[PDB]
Write a protein that binds this ligand. Structure first.
Ligand SMILES: NC1(C(=O)O)CCCC1
Length: 271
């Protein structure tokens, strides 16, 4: 019974309360198809989880003949390396920390495959190809990471991302993006929800984040749109501890799904 850890992140993983009898409300898609849901414990009581990643998990479990139990990451984070003591060895938090500690056997979430994480865990082939993009108010046009309003910032156009995120780290390490980072570090938000709200409230002109997330957020709000070319393209993959016996088949299934329309069907169903 594999321990699956995930996190709230629509449309990949929705999190809702169970009904009074402890079950998940029976719901259907706009075309009458049943919405598959799994019970996921977390911040701790049983809750209802569903979405792109849950549909993927259900498919993998069926295809690979395994049972599982899902829980939401305890600290509500994806995972970054942080100094937590006087030693010289940083420690991973979020889902990365849980996978490495054994609290989880697989990370099933919109987790970016990057260099730092790849140094400690292994990933399946990507179940989603995306990259960083920009969220702005309808009518605003930004070409991409090279747009002057970003490279030559001023207070007339404020942009930012989420503090302590892997995206924040991406800019902090990009020497060529020092100018941008200096500007962002002065406006970064505590959470994506807050930043997205700030964009609708005209308090923030641009929010830099995952295109896989922003494309959905934009589709849900008419006053919001994504703009420009993607930069820092990346994939989302299932995380497992090194040398896992599940890796090969998880990867083969995902590659097969990209080739047989299954992944395209999830795209249409959830966005
Ligand atoms: N995909 C993210 C990650 O850290 O894995 C990047 C920002 C949202 C979460």
């Amino acid at each position: 019974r594999l321990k699956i850890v995930t996190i709230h992140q629509e449309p990949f993983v929705y999190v809702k309360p169970t009904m009074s009898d402890g079950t998940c409300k029976e719901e259907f898609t706009v075309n009458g198809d049943p919405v598959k849901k799994v019970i996921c414990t977390g911040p701790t009581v049983p809750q209802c989880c569903y979405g792109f990643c849950i549909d993927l998990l259900i498919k993998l479990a069926r295809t690979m003949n395994f049972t599982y139990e899902v829980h939401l990451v305890a600290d509500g984070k994806f995972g970054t390396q942080e100094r937590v003591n006087n030693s010289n060895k940083k420690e991973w938090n979020g889902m990365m920390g849980e996978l490495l500690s054994g609290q989880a056997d697989m990370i099933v979430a919109p987790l970016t495959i990057n260099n730092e994480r790849a140094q400690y865990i292994e990933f399946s082939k990507p179940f989603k190809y995306q990259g960083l993009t920009i969220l702005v108010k309808k009518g605003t046009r930004i070409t991409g990471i090279n747009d002057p309003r970003l490279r030559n910032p001023s207070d007339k156009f404020i942009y930012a991302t989420v503090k302590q995120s892997s995206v924040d780290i991406y800019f902090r390490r990009q020497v060529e993006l020092s100018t941008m980072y200096r500007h962002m570090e002065k406006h970064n938000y505590e959470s994506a929800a807050e930043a997205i709200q700030a964009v609708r409230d005209n308090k923030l002109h641009a929010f830099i984040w995952d295109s896989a997330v922003l494309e959905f957020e934009a589709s849900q709000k008419c006053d919001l749109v994504t703009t420009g070319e993607l930069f820092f393209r990346s994939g989302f993959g299932i995380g497992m501890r090194k040398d896992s016996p599940w890796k090969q088949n998880v990867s083969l299934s995902i590659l097969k799904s990209h080739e047989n329309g299954f992944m395209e069907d999830l795209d249409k169903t959830w966005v």
